[model samples]
Target: ITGTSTVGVGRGVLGDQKNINTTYSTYYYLQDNTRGNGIFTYDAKYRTTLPGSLWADADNQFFASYDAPAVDAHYYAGVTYDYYKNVHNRLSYDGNNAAIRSSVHYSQGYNNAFWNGSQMVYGDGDGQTFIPLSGGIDVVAHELTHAVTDYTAGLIYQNESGAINEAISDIFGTLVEFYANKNPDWEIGEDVYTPGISGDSLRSMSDPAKYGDPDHYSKRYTGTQDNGGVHINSGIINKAAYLISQGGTHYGVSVVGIGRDKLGKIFYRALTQYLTPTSNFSQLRAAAVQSATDLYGSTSQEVASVKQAFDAVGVK
Candidate 1:
């Protein structure tokens, strides 16, 4: 669609008003032209179809309830794009400025979002469990990071590798949250996971045990459900990532904090340069160690912290 870059005013799922990137042709379209494929957002019309229509607005203004998800979905995708480009020195998720596309209002009472091997999708939750998930930058980035993984490490989506895939998404998603510095914490989906509740998240990295998730390798789930517990077992790696950044004593083991910047650098290096399609937790430890050594020398505190964090999490 040939259009001029423009701005639109809209209210998001959280009832906050803001300006969003948009495109104007015959009608104002919910498309951001500032970066990568212009952050195209579409309305799913509470259906199961993909990318139903480019969101249209009158006079480039959107304040209605139906416009809320589109606004956040488009806005959050741009934020995630900026995070990767600025922090990692990468261009977009594929490192080549691929167009980022997303669909919102996917279905009634839907409660999740995901990258469907190509584009991003978001759901308007059941209202009790969640609000529109696009309102949460962490949730938006978490799904997009899966696409990043698909292009980078190509981590297989099963067994130990699958759990690593999920953890990498969680790690970078949380990092993106901190990168934006919006009430940063080691929590995932805190803002939109449970609309009826406050100060709670779908998962916890600071203390995975806080949400019944294992914080140690010894307690990892080894089940057939959830693709060998990809979502469940990711807690082990999430805990390790948390310990690497913040430092903590857990289950009788202690780790020295290396801070968030180094934590992101180390993990990004591992993800981009060290990990393989089928890497497991033990392999992740090795990769993180090597990545830290590469960035901060073999005997630097960063490397030491990386090793100790893994060991503390029982990732021998």
Candidate 2:
């Protein structure tokens, strides 16, 4: 819709107010229109419906004292978009300027947010475990990165490949968190998860073992549940990525850090050019090795660190 540009400020799910890029269409939509199809946010109205309606305001002014989840969901999507475009040279999730859409307040007391294959959706947490999930920029980027995976590597959602998919999301999500510099850390969903519990997060990339997740291949789960432990086994890959970027030691292993920008360059190439849908843990090591070689030469520390990081995670 053709509309006048506008700015709207609102309190997010975590009680911090931020000005959101908005447009004053006929009904004051929550759209940037400056970005690609403009990051769109919708209200599920505590129902099971998806993307109920585009948010609207009376005078191109808004606040989320009553709907804080929607406010953060819209804002975070925009941030994630900018991260991918500015940092990765990608237009959108699909690399084709796809519309970024999200739905918040989905279902009553829901405790999760997902990409839904087409758009992003979030549930208000069960109060004890999480708040509105979009309040976490890492979570938002994590979910949207699933779309990036689908369009690129098309990683299958089961077994080792599935675990790699999950880990990829966590890896980039953490990078996006760091890129935004919002109290960044190598943790996922720390901001929106367990609001009642302090100093804990959904997962830890620096030390997945802190959350009972395996930082080594020997600890990988082979269960049929959780899509063959996709979320569970991802710690191995997450740890490797963390080591590649920051360097670390685990289980008598060590890696030299390659830094975040180089880590992202290597992984993005692996995801877009080197990976296949069925690539497993071992294959991932090869892909990252080759990706690093492509960017930094086979004899460079970048390539060496990629190998050492995966080896530290027991990928060898």
Candidate 3:
């Protein structure tokens, strides 16, 4: 069951909260006759309206007293689920028919959202500058993608490994957003906060330079802030994925030539199929180029374009 937090975050409210702390544990209870387990309740916190909260959870924070959890959480969750299912043929978060649960409005005046290896947790904004964290699709996808990365690559959260972990999350997160057809703009977290603040996005995919931050691979972009700057340096890989998918001019000189769909699929394949936990940017580029070639033929323009895009990003 999905539980809404005081602010619009979605949390998975298990029927038996007793086992909630166990890492990577699975519960298989039938949908009916489950009181707190089967029934999904939406908590109204930062949300302004509600129709039986989007998911089922019993407990709610004080913010739920003010606003109902927004439907965006459920909406994007559905979009994310569908994207993976359609593109990768994966079902749900666990791939085993496990139900997906989200919790909204976690802590009071909270500023971030996270996936705790079992479920997604969101925090209400401080209410002074930020709003509910779960209100944005990209944000929700970002958290869920973290789970995916952990399960697959198990990328170590340090140095280049950490950056790839963060970068993969952003890649899938943006893909989920685009799959939902939610505004095509390249900025992340734009919907959660007011526009008065400048460059408030956690990251940028289209143009990392706009934030006045160093390029994704610059030596200066150490992962010191959060686990070796995983989140900060992710812009480099993120930008590479974006440029490859869109098939545009890179660094104002190199021409990238694949269509969005083909490029996205190739990159997705490389990430899920070819990449290892220790894969670095150079290895990632090689794997992606190889994947493109395998799918589109070695002589295909798409393969060459993928390589060129990687080169433009200094990945080679």
Candidate 4:
């Protein structure tokens, strides 16, 4: 699910020869129509005037017009495709010539978007709190990262494995957001939500305590929600990475500066190259330390801090 695949480059705007500028490349959006027949469509016109009824109902609740979903999917697919290719030197989702396919405005008021093994699916929000799941680059990148994890460790969706899974997505999600230079805050999903909502983000990286909950790990970690609270427990690792990258104090322990990009690269290397499916907190800690050492030498201060942060998170 995450290897390399070859894709052909086309030179047309949504299959129209008139708009086929030599300066631009085009991509095809393939889907099954209401009758379950295969359909291939091109991205050309901006379908902004259409309402939320012109698309196939896949998820059943959330829905939007065909044109808007096409516009959003095309934009997000291009952005995510470019981010991986340019920033990480990744050719595609699987490192091969993998063609990216996305379905937008899926289901009626679906409320969430995810990469369902093969393609990206988005839901048109209820309009009260959320507008659409494809409203941000980070959301796109987050779902794509799930595909990445599925290819890499295939981590089980429980306990430490699940936390690592969610953490990896959030880490890269934040990276994509910042790489696109879309607001500098560490909060996620701030743009998709309505102004009427009291909470601005689904989660906060800079200050988890701002959500009025314990940000650090405790023995009472077992039992909560979100598949053993993988999303919640992920706060520990997320904060650790943030502190290591940005230089800050966590639980009153001073962290040495190591630069954000460097920290992220180290963690990425460890997650993708060294970590395995069965990797636990201890294994993850060791892998990160080894990755830092391999990248910056065994005696580097960054390596020590990486290990220190893991220890602070009860990874011992």
Candidate 5:
């Protein structure tokens, strides 16, 4: 939809007001041309089909209850894009300034959001479990990072590789949250999970075991469910990433805090330059170590902390 790029005001799922980039053709459409190629958001209309219809509004204001999800989805995708470009010097998910697309209101009472190969899809959660997921910046970043992984590492979403993929999303997701400075924490989906329950998130990186997720390799799930426990086992890597950013000790192994910027630099380097499609947990450790070495030298504390963090997680 080519037209004059415009800004529209909207209240998000959480009732927070924000300005969104929209296109003013015949009607105002959710198409942002500010970042990369563009960021386009659509209304799924509670159906299963993808990329649905481009969201339209007669006026340039988006305040309807139904417009909440689209507003946040469009706004947050831009934020995530900024995080990548400004922080990592990467343009969009593909590193080639690919147009980011997302669809909201996907299926009634759906409890999850995901990147469906080509674009992002968000569910209007069954109120008990979640609200519109785009309400959470971390959730948006997590899904977009999956696109990043798809383009870069192409990690096979199974077994240890899958766990690594999930953890990578969580790592960058949290980093992006911090980049935006929005109630930042090493927690995933806290803003959108269990609307009835406060202070609880879908997963925790600082203390994964708080919700029964494995925080160490010895306790890694060896099950067939969850695609070899991709979500379950990610806690181990998540905990490791948490330790690398914020110094902590687990199982008597202590890691020196290197801070989030360095953690992101190391991990981003590993994801883009070293990791392969089938890279497992051990391979991930090697990639991170080499990445740290490449960025901060072989003997730098960055490399040392990378080793300590993986060791703390019992990755070796």
Candidate 6:
């Protein structure tokens, strides 16, 4: 809709008040023209259809209970946009400033969210499992990072390649969380996982085995379930990433911590410049090593830490 871009006040899924970019066209619509082409958020009306309708409000003040998800989805999309643009020197997910779109309040009791090849879809989970997922910044970043992977590496979502894909989402998601400086941690979905459970999350990057995920290649899953254990085996790569950013010993191998910014640069470079659709775990190590070498030189501690991190995770 063509109209004047304006700012609107709203409360997110967690009841945090924030300002959102909206457009005024008789009624206010959740179309932010400030970043990229624009960031558009829509209401799914609890149905399965996508991009249902651009969220519209008469007063441009979003405070109703049903409006919570849209508020966060809209606001967080902008935050994720800033993360990529300011931190990575990239425009949007496509590196072309493509319009970012999201639909919230998807199917009733829906427990998960995903990027459906074109746009983002979020589920308003049942009270027991989750609240609105956009409440967690990492969750939003994770889904958007999938789009980044699609546009760049195009990693296949199965077997070792699939695990790498999942881990890459987790890795960038965590980095984005840290970038936002909002209760940052190495956990995947802590804010929206369970209302009753505290200190628990969907997955752990620092210690994947805390929830029965493999932290080493020797224990990698070989089953067909979960698309050859894409989620399950991602723990190994996640552990390696965690080690690279925040040094630790796993399987008696030691890694010297190189901090978060360097970790993000190394992985981002690997994803955008070196990784291919068929790249597996070993290939990922080579890519990261090469990326670090390219950025910090072949003999820099950055390159050595990349090697030790992969070696510690048993990724030869």
What TM-score against the true fold does each predicted structure earn? 0.98, 0.97, 0.76, 0.77, 0.99, 0.99
What is the lDDT of every predicted structure here?
0.90, 0.89, 0.62, 0.63, 0.95, 0.94
> Which portions of model 4 show Cα errors greater than 4 Å?
1-66, 212-214
Q: Choose 1 or 5, whichever is better by lDDT.
A: 5
Q: Name the weakest run of 10 consecutive residues (lDDT summed) in model 6.
A: 127-136
Give one digit per residue, the lDDT tens place, for model 1 in 200-253: 999998888889888888899988999898988899999999999999887778
Q: Report the lDDT tens digits of candidate 3 across residue range 1-316.
A: 2222122232321111111111111322111212112212244454423322344333321123233333444445656767777887766655543455566666577777777776666777786556677667778888777777776667777767777777777777777777777575567777776546755675678777776544535433753777776776777777777777775676663656555578667876786778888887788888888888889889988888777776667777
Model 5 agreement with the true structure over 1-316: per-residue lDDT tens digits: 8899999999999999999999999999999999989999999999999889999999989999999999999999999999999999999999999999999999999999999999999999999999999999999999999999999999999999999999999999999999999799999999999988999999999999989999999999998999999999999999999999999889999999999999999999999999999999999999999999999999899999999999999998
Off by over 4 Å in 2: none
Q: Could you tell me the TM-score of candidate 6?
A: 0.99
Rank the models by lDDT, top first.
Answer: 5, 6, 1, 2, 4, 3
Task: Using lDDT as the measure, name the better of candidate 2 and candidate 3.
Answer: 2
- Candidate with better TM-score, 1 vs 4: 1
Which residue pairs clash within candidate 2?
Answer: none
Residue range with the least summed lDDT across 10 consecutive positions in model 1: 31-40
Question: How much does each candidate deviate from the true structure in C-alpha RMSD?
Answer: 1.0, 1.1, 8.4, 8.5, 0.6, 0.6
Give the alpha carbon lDDT tens digit for every residue of 152-271 in model 4.
Answer: 777777777788787888888888788767475677777676647755777777775665433567731578577787777777777777777777666667777687687778877887
| Candidate scoring better on TM-score of 1 and 3 | 1
Per-residue lDDT over 1-316 for candidate 2, one digit per residue giving the tens place of the 0 to 100 score: 5788788887888888788888886777888777886788888888988878888877654554556887888888888889899988999899988989999889988999999899999999888899889889999999999999999999999999999999999989988888889899999898988888889998999888898988889899987999999999999999999999998777777788979999899999999998999999999999999988888898999999898888888898
How many angstroms is residue 65 displaced in model 4 relative to the true structure, after the best TM-score fit? 7.6
On a 0 to 1 TM-score scale, where does candidate 4 land against the true structure?
Answer: 0.77
Least lDDT summed over 10 consecutive residues: which range in candidate 4?
A: 16-25
